[PDB]
């Protein structure tokens, strides 16, 4: 409990270097073309490892297909690694340093860093030696494995046989890299040469790893151990149709180039990324839609913009191919800072506008008899405009949504009894709200009140008019000859 914190711990720093410089190792021999730096401009080129002109390291092969064969014992066909070696000025950029290494690739991407990571330069177990397995004798071969050999580097008398714990850190390190090993076996030697590493043997087979543990005791703990790491490069190399391998990204591709548009993660897990094509004339990536029956694709886009204070902003554009904006049918919700209240945020969504006037005719439905003492039943009152409560959309967690509704006056006249005792402005149609009329009275004004239930909504009005003609003064209930312009939406602010 003590020691695992301390020593286990320290080890996976260790483990993770060493994947880390395995993994990239690996991704260099796995790319077949490779991307440089040429005339500051990027070029696909063949891999130095397959090209038959190449020299060392690059043209280094082992044969040793067959896991349980011996090992080359010549330098030429194992790439030796670490210190005195100058093997990594061959996988690492030539502008590592700024006047140029003796390699002659600038890769445009680091597969290792430049400087091999310094906890490896004192740690006990090194990569001493790696093994390209070439999958057939020609000069360039592809390679069909790739082992390394991890010397171990025992600061003790004791203890020959103490790398065990890391072969779990390992493990883990590689499935943190999409990685596994093909197989794990004991090497050994008795020198300080890369070329004396062969298989060790129990009863003569190999001996794996796993076999380790119970095979101990028969083992010469003087000589010097190790671990071979076989790592097969196309494992996890292809995305497949049952989806068990992750993508980097993916980029489609225009009259066979890889110019079209291109989708990876964030750091998130979250989001997937759009973002143009290398073919794209203008950087205005897009998402979209085709019926293929004729017209055109619909497409969410990206374009440049502007924000409140004239700064650098992007926004979406839903459009066609003509560029004009398209359709989308939708509940939205609008989130803003409350005008009163800056620290609050509320939430609307789009309202919509009904016309209507109120529907008294009759003298006996407008005429309040006893105003002020009358007291208003607005759920039961004739001319009253009723509609139904709406249903607002869903909204986020935290935001209950109101129904609401208000109502504002479209046309209003103080109409008055004619000669038959009729009323004749009538502003039920607000094409023809002109056409009716005759004689009117001096305006009081209207009190228009609106009033909700659990399902419905009550409009009501009260309009006072004064009568010159015949002196008196009348209270209206609901006429005919007022109009309002109704807005209804959903909202986080209640209704009053």
Same mark, same amino acid.
């Given at each position: 409990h003590m020691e695992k914190e301390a020593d286990e711990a320290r080890r996976?720093?260790?483990?993770?270097?060493?994947? %880390?410089?395995?993994?990239?190792?690996?991704?260099?021999?796995?790319?077949?073309?490779?991307?440089?730096?040429?005339?500051?401009?990027?070029?696909?080129?063949?891999?130095?490892?397959?090209?038959?002109?190449?020299?060392?390291?690059?043209?280094?092969?082992?044969?040793?297909?067959?896991?349980?064969?011996?090992?080359?014992?010549?330098?030429?066909?194992?790439?030796?690694?670490?210190?005195?070696?100058?093997?990594?000025?061959?996988?690492?950029?030539?502008?590592?340093?700024?006047?140029?290494?003796?390699?002659?690739?600038?890769? %445009?991407?680091?597969?290792?860093?430049?400087?091999?990571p310094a906890i490896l330069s004192n740690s006990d177990l090194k990569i001493d030696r790696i093994d390209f397995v070439a999958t057939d004798n020609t000069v360039g071969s592809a390679i069909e494995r790739v082992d390394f050999i991890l010397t171990f580097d025992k600061s003790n008398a004791n203890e020959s046989f103490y790398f065990s714990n890391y072969v779990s850190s390992l493990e883990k390190a590689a499935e943190q890299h999409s990685i596994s090993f093909k197989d794990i076996y004991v090497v050994e030697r008795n020198s300080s040469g890369a070329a004396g590493w062969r298989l060790t043997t129990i009863s003569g087979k190999p001996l794996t790893f796993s076999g380790l543990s119970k095979n101990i005791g028969s083992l010469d703990k003087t000589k010097n151990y190790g671990l071979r790491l076989s790592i097969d490069p196309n494992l996890g190399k292809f995305l497949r149709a049952d989806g068990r391998v992750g993508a980097d990204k993916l980029c489609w591709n225009i009259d066979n180039k890889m110019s079209g548009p291109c989708l990876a993660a964030d750091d998130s897990g979250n989001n997937l990324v759009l973002t143009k094509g290398k073919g794209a004339k203008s950087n205005e990536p897009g998402l979209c839609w085709d019926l293929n029956t004729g017209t055109s694709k619909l497409c969410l886009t990206q374009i440049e913009g502007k924000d409140n204070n004239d700064k650098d902003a992007s926004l979406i554009k839903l459009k066609d191919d003509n560029g004009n904006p398209a359709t989308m049918l939708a509940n939205i919700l609008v989130e803003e800072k409350s005008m009163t209240d800056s620290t609050k945020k509320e939430l609307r969504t789009i309202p919509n506008t009904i016309?209507?006037?109120?529907?008294?005719?009759?003298? %006996?439905?407008?005429?309040?008899?006893?105003?002020?003492?009358?007291?208003?039943?607005?759920?039961?009152?004739?001319?009253?405009?009723?509609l139904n409560v709406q249903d607002c959309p869903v909204s986020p967690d935290g935001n209950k949504l109101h129904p609401r509704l208000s109502a504002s006056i479209a046309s209003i006249v103080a109409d008055t009894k004619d000669s038959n005792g009729k009323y004749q402005a009538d502003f039920s149609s607000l094409a023809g709200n002109r056409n009716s009329g005759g004689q009117l009275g001096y305006l009081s004004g209207t009190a228009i009140q609106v009033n909700q239930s659990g399902s419905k909504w009550y409009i009501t009005a009260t309009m006072g008019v004064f009568d010159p003609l015949t002196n008196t003064t009348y209270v209206y209930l609901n006429p005919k000859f007022l109009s309002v312009n109704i807005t209804t939406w959903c909202s986080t602010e209640p209704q009053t």
């Amino acid at each position: 409990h003590m020691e695992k914190e301390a020593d286990e711990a320290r080890r996976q720093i260790v483990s993770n270097a060493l994947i %880390s410089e395995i993994a990239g190792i690996v991704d260099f021999v796995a790319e077949e073309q490779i991307t440089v730096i040429e005339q500051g401009i990027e070029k696909e080129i063949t891999n130095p490892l397959y090209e038959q002109s190449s020299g060392i390291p690059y043209i280094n092969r082992t044969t040793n297909k067959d896991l349980n064969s011996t090992m080359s014992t010549n330098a030429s066909e194992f790439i030796n690694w670490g210190a005195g070696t100058s093997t990594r000025i061959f996988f690492t950029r030539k502008y590592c340093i700024s006047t140029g290494t003796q390699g002659n690739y600038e890769f %445009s991407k680091d597969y290792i860093p430049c400087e091999e990571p310094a906890i490896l330069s004192n740690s006990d177990l090194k990569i001493d030696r790696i093994d390209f397995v070439a999958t057939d004798n020609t000069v360039g071969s592809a390679i069909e494995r790739v082992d390394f050999i991890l010397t171990f580097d025992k600061s003790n008398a004791n203890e020959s046989f103490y790398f065990s714990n890391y072969v779990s850190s390992l493990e883990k390190a590689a499935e943190q890299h999409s990685i596994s090993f093909k197989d794990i076996y004991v090497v050994e030697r008795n020198s300080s040469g890369a070329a004396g590493w062969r298989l060790t043997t129990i009863s003569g087979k190999p001996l794996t790893f796993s076999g380790l543990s119970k095979n101990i005791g028969s083992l010469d703990k003087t000589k010097n151990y190790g671990l071979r790491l076989s790592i097969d490069p196309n494992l996890g190399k292809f995305l497949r149709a049952d989806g068990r391998v992750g993508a980097d990204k993916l980029c489609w591709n225009i009259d066979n180039k890889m110019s079209g548009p291109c989708l990876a993660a964030d750091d998130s897990g979250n989001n997937l990324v759009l973002t143009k094509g290398k073919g794209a004339k203008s950087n205005e990536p897009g998402l979209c839609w085709d019926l293929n029956t004729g017209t055109s694709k619909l497409c969410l886009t990206q374009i440049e913009g502007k924000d409140n204070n004239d700064k650098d902003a992007s926004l979406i554009k839903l459009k066609d191919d003509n560029g004009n904006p398209a359709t989308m049918l939708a509940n939205i919700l609008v989130e803003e800072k409350s005008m009163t209240d800056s620290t609050k945020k509320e939430l609307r969504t789009i309202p919509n506008t009904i016309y209507a006037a109120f529907s008294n005719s009759n003298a %006996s439905d407008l005429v309040i008899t006893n105003p002020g003492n009358y007291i208003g039943n607005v759920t039961s009152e004739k001319g009253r405009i009723e509609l139904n409560v709406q249903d607002c959309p869903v909204s986020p967690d935290g935001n209950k949504l109101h129904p609401r509704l208000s109502a504002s006056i479209a046309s209003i006249v103080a109409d008055t009894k004619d000669s038959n005792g009729k009323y004749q402005a009538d502003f039920s149609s607000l094409a023809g709200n002109r056409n009716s009329g005759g004689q009117l009275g001096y305006l009081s004004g209207t009190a228009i009140q609106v009033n909700q239930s659990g399902s419905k909504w009550y409009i009501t009005a009260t309009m006072g008019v004064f009568d010159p003609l015949t002196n008196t003064t009348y209270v209206y209930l609901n006429p005919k000859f007022l109009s309002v312009n109704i807005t209804t939406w959903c909202s986080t602010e209640p209704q009053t």
